[PDB]
Design a binder for this molecule. Structure first.
Ligand SMILES: [Cl-]
Length: 157
């Protein structure tokens, strides 16, 4: 097939910095380290204030992944859209780009949650700048109908 779109280093670096700032796990340094969905489950648990995730951590990666993709589908602004936001297939094939889309959407849902506002000042300015751009993209597009294409173009930079 034609070559896929790629994740820009600055976009991945900011998303990883955000993930690490949640302290739901030991540090991660590459987006592929999110593939096992463990951190993603912990992030959803943090959003809910519940422990449902703890039961799903016992399941295999494909089941963990379905759980996360289901959360993202359930919580989108138009649950009735035909294109799903995330390809479970591409995640199982090791797509950092698809894992970054997951992480970005969980950033969105975290910022809309009951948790206290993040201290954005904790990040290096380069990272603050990228996070600002990421959250502006969410503001400007998350409720659109070409979101999937738009998000991929954004993440490739
Ligand atoms: Cl946050």
């Amino acid at each position: 097939g034609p070559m896929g779109m790629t994740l820009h280093a600055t976009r991945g670096a900011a998303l990883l910095s955000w993930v690490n700032s949640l302290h739901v796990a030991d540090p991660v340094e590459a987006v592929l380290q999110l593939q096992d969905c463990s951190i993603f489950i912990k992030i959803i648990d943090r959003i809910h204030g519940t422990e449902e995730g703890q039961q799903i951590l016992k399941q295999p990666v494909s089941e963990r992944l379905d759980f996360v993709c289901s959360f993202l589908q359930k919580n989108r602004k138009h649950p009735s859209s035909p294109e799903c936001l995330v390809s479970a297939q591409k995640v199982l094939e090791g797509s950092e780009l698809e894992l970054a889309k997951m992480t970005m959407l969980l950033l969105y849902h975290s910022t809309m949650s009951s948790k206290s506002p993040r201290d954005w000042e904790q990040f290096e300015y380069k990272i603050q700048a990228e996070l600002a751009v990421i959250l502006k993209f969410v503001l400007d597009h998350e409720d659109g109908l070409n979101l999937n294409e738009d998000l991929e173009n954004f993440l490739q930079k």
